[PDB]
Design a protein around this ligand. Sequence first.
Ligand SMILES: [Cu+2]
Ligand SMILES: [Cu+2]
Ligand SMILES: [Cu+2]
Length: 470
Amino acid sequence: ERPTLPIPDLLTTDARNRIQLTIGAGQSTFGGKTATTWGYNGNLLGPAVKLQRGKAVTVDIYNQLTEETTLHWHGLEVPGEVDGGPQGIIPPGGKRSVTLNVDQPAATCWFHPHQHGKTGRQVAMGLAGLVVIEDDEILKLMLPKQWGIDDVPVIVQDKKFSADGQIDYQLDVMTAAVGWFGDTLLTNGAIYPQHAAPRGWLRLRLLNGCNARSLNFATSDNRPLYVIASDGGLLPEPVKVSELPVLMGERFEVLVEVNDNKPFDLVTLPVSQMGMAIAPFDKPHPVMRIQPIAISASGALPDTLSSLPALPSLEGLTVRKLQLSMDPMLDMMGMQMLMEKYGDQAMAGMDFHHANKINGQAFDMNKPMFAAAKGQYERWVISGVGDMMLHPFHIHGTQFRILSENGKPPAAHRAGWKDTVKVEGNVSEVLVKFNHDAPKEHAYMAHSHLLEHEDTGMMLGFTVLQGDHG
Ligand SMILES: [Cu+2]
Ligand SMILES: [Cu+2]
Ligand SMILES: [Cu+2]
């Protein structure tokens, strides 16, 4: 029998208004082999922290690893001091506390390490958790809302393991060039689980938690997915899709219909990204089995969900150009190693530690590239012209609107609030506004979310201090 889908615990504040997260090493089992893994409040992955718009929470973070880490709340708009970028060091055996004052629409965000140069390994070892933000608006909708029954998080990740069963992560030339990817797909940490869902509407909060692998969700029997929310919250109305591409670090919430006596699989379809259509990912691959059950369910697919504000006029806004690049030598060496090992299938459908760059500079923790304005829209133009690697570009401190995505206006289910934009051999443009401060000592990051590229230099720091005084 397939294992049941693990359900992260939904963790709320205690009487002291505190949430405790312990970062630690333990053991997990994959395919009958034990592996050392890391987790928040457990052996692997983490809980779902539940936050309400307009309410403060204090998080106490206990680092019980033997190495430094940081804790970043990806998708949360918070000041730099509590954003948990690479400057937010938590010593091994130490504790750090942050007060989060949540001020943004309901959405599914997530959290993960951001340790300088080591983010890929620390996520690969198992660290990731979820953030569920609620507000008044969303609860009035009739959405499926029973956590772990008809409202379920789905954190999808690949791993590769060595013969001893341990997770096999090394940041070497090939993995630095193409990304860390594996042959084993996990869904909330389990291999091909089943989830028992009541007849009616099932809400899936999908996260691509892979280091480097893009995904493309669909159902085994071609039933549609109704997209209701993206990274930064609800869309204005549901968007019906037959397939749903999801970049690394992106979330979408979808509703799917569950009918009596008709089990089906959520699957991922082959993608056109270097290295990612190697067997078993050359064909549709299962993510999990949905098994209909007969218990109570009241959830609805609402005709209307929210209102999206009009894009502001673009005239007169500051433009920032961010040119992404990879060292041609790393690109050539890594691509050759990939082709030699896997052959043509590795391109199907198509020293090095500071090799990857933005505007000619590898990330410098001591030197923010610029100071962005506070409380003012800017247009950021991000280019990957010059290579054909996938760069899901993420900017801390904001939920943004995509104006142009890699050659075209964004797809309808990508036109709302986003914290990731596709850049791949073309140029994208986003409209951003920073509402919180970030000083040089706790700067915001902007980077590709292909973690091995972030780790080898494709990140910049930026500060936010003041708006116009002119
Ligand atoms: Cu992230
Ligand atoms: Cu982030
Ligand atoms: Cu980041």
